[PDB]
Design an enzyme around this catalytic site. Sequence first.
Site, mmCIF file in Angstrom:
data_model
loop_
_atom_site.group_PDB
_atom_site.id
_atom_site.type_symbol
_atom_site.label_atom_id
_atom_site.label_comp_id
_atom_site.label_asym_id
_atom_site.label_seq_id
_atom_site.Cartn_x
_atom_site.Cartn_y
_atom_site.Cartn_z
ATOM 1 N N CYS A 1 38.220 -14.173 11.433
ATOM 2 C CA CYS A 1 37.283 -14.888 10.812
ATOM 3 C C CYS A 1 36.377 -15.124 11.397
ATOM 4 O O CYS A 1 35.048 -15.082 11.239
ATOM 5 C CB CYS A 1 37.656 -15.362 8.842
ATOM 6 S SG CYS A 1 37.793 -14.384 7.957
ATOM 7 N N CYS B 1 76.443 -48.353 13.128
ATOM 8 C CA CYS B 1 77.341 -47.616 11.737
ATOM 9 C C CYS B 1 76.080 -46.090 12.033
ATOM 10 O O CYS B 1 77.062 -45.509 12.071
ATOM 11 C CB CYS B 1 76.892 -48.464 10.648
ATOM 12 S SG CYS B 1 75.379 -48.499 10.387
ATOM 13 N N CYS C 1 41.252 -18.876 10.902
ATOM 14 C CA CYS C 1 41.376 -17.037 10.807
ATOM 15 C C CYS C 1 40.590 -17.245 12.812
ATOM 16 O O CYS C 1 39.637 -17.040 12.479
ATOM 17 C CB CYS C 1 41.162 -16.788 9.801
ATOM 18 S SG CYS C 1 41.263 -14.988 9.925
ATOM 19 N N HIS D 1 73.105 -49.693 5.546
ATOM 20 C CA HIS D 1 74.116 -49.928 6.116
ATOM 21 C C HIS D 1 74.150 -48.002 6.026
ATOM 22 O O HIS D 1 73.697 -47.129 4.813
ATOM 23 C CB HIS D 1 74.937 -50.034 5.651
ATOM 24 C CG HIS D 1 76.328 -49.976 6.217
ATOM 25 N ND1 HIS D 1 76.898 -50.823 7.676
ATOM 26 C CD2 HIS D 1 77.907 -49.462 5.960
ATOM 27 C CE1 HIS D 1 78.574 -50.427 7.276
ATOM 28 N NE2 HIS D 1 79.063 -49.310 6.282
HETATM 29 ZN ZN LIG Z 1 40.654 -14.178 8.048
#
Ligand SMILES: [Zn+2]
EC number: 3.4.19.12
Lengths: 321, 76, 514
Positions: free
Chosen positions: A187, A14, A184, A268
């Site tokens: 960063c 099905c 980051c 089903h």
């Molecule tokens: Zn950053």
Amino acid sequence: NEHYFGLVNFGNTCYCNSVLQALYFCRPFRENVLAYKAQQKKKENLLTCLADLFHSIATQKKKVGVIPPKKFISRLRKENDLFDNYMQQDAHEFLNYLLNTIADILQEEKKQEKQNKPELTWVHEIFQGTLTNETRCLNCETVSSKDEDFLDLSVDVEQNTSITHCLRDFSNTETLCSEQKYYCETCCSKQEAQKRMRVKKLPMILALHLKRFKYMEQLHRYTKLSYRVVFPLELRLFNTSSDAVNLDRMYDLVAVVVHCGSGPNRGHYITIVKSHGFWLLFDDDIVEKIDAQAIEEFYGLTSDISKNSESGYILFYQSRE
Amino acid sequence: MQIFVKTLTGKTITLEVEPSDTIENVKAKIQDKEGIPPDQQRLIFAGKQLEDGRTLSDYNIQKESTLHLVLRLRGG
Amino acid sequence: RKVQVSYVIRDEVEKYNRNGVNALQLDPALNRLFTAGRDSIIRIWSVNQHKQDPYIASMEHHTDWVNDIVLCCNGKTLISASSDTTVKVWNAHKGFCMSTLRTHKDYVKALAYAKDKELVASAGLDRQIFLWDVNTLTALTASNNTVTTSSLSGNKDSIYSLAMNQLGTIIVSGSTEKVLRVWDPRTCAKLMKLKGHTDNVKALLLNRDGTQCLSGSSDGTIRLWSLGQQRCIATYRVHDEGVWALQVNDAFTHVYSGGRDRKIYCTDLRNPDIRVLICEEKAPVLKMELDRSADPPPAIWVATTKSTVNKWTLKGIHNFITPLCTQPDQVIKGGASIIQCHILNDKRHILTKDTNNNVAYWDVLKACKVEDLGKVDFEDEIKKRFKMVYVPNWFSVDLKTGMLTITLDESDCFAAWVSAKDAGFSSPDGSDPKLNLGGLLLQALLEYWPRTHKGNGYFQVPPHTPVIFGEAGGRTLFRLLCRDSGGETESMLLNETVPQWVIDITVDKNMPKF
Ligand SMILES: [Zn+2]
């Protein structure tokens, strides 16, 4: 010249039948498949079987009947050992396989004519879309965009909501914080960030997959989410992009693949399609008309008082052509 | 390299992967944060459900990629 | 939680900042400058100008970025808040750590100080604010201290800024919640919410009375709020990008502002049309500190993304967009920060690109720089130094401090076994055995620990190597120099912090199986 035909279930197939029904009522797909049938490569692959099947349906003498899709199912089992069994499977998993499998067949076909930068198949022209994931580092405030393609959208689902609201929070700015801090690069550390996924390019057909499962980290098992999640007959979708051109596409519900069952380990699958104004239900071999109000009103569930909870799983939204 | 996974509730989780990392190994990293056994997980990316044998580099999954975590709903 | 061993490839004395400064602090009593660096080191400088070497000393205890530094107790006592989730109490005159408040559960982003009440506030990403009495934190007497923490409740999002008036009758928090929450720090009860901002508040300033507040948001707007009126009285749109740092004149009639756009502007609060441009920095402004020796302030100290701290002379405002400055008059030097790092196919060597675009070759195992390659193509060099070997990963690298930091974790530490000949350790005439890199290193790090007694017996790690033991989450357990393991008190500390997975190969010497 309309053909409403059922499909025989050959032992827990099905999940497969229901997807084929929804795909058949997505006219660009059906038209494309029927067109592929015509060239007649005559080398048995899953795509040729699909086209041969869709051809029987389209070129039948009576407008209503039943087709045993033995031929296709045989090929599906030969081509995939994970589907080569009498076990119950997931419809979305089948859809994904089928769509990529038939895109990969076409990708090869496209390449073999060049034989004697990438190219997009007609599977992609129908269902593909593009997202843009923007990530703003909260310390340096530098934003990092990233485009990622999609064939369907797996939306989270909440109790007593709508498909529109789920699409709304899917595209909402989430905060990456605590254990989920973003790394980051400017960063050179992990910082809190804002993550937002917005639609860059709209698909001709929006395929929506509802994440109707909850994992119980402690109980070491997952449940089926049978929440009342309403779906509209129409969907307003707007475009982000270049901002040189803007799209405000209006979509229409063509088909709903629905999973019946209280749990996620057994069930089903059935399909409800909109064909020529009125709606109709396909339970394998059985094909019957249904009144528009009885469609959405039965695909959710209020409290618990609804036997073997039939819930909408895959939704097909077609652009207004 | 760090990639994202959109969990079953829409919550996004980060993963510390390598392009060399297998899809089954990505699943194990998700198991640590989410608790879901890999056998039960399904990850969709670029409209393609990632195959256990393959690696992230194969699927061209790069930093900032969002994998969509999803489960099964078995039906007969 | 699981424990990870870590070390830093650096020189014993790291005189100059190696990642930019998050916050500054000026002692008017001794003419000294405190620089809270992202290199996890706070440093003291002499601001008398006529000193060839301004460096005084460096306060080293922290493990992640020092986000803010509050100088109190009329002269010296320094309170620091860091991404290492702790608050450290320091005797600023001698430069040593007294107490470490382990009360925060995430990066401690900001500190607030009320001189007239010797009260210090701490807040961070963990959406909690704590109030502390400096005279209690500094007290050595311990007279039924019963040290119960005092916290302010309200914040629904991660706190990025804090401010307290000189008297300690008002406290205001800035967060990603945009809205700024206020409380009476004395009674701990809520006061007001200040709706106006469409972004994050990273800079908060209060007058002496606390009747009015200045706020610098990432939305680019400076806002003057009237607390008694509980509403924004003035909105100042000066910077093209977000504003992160703020400083005010003693009067509270002029606002000194800096943000992501690298520009520094003194704007007349009374009439905003009188906006003076001080200068444009070479990096986005993170925090500022005025020279409050005279009114108007004669100078301003600017901390940015760059490791160099500049002092710009304000003298000329009364006489004078063209800037008042082009070059700073006094400059605190800054060293290079490692911005890029690649681990080669042998899991022993590393390539790095510093802020000055210089490329360096490094030995992870022997914990040292092997070669200086200078201003060359880093991308090409990686490919040029390709190794046709398979060695599984066994360590982690982090350039959060701008210095190379290596992390050894239980899951993969003992994953790499290499041949002694293939590792360079030539032993004539003994056949090259398979050596486990992680093990060999762990041994070299805790070489001076009596419990382990000699060493790995192949190489030596520089004896001044910082060896940190801490949880995977964030909390540090213990920190020491490689050579300090030998001391009684350190050896005792090692016994209470060193995990079993490390002890299995260092003291028990049960080398893992292939
Ligand atoms: Zn950053």
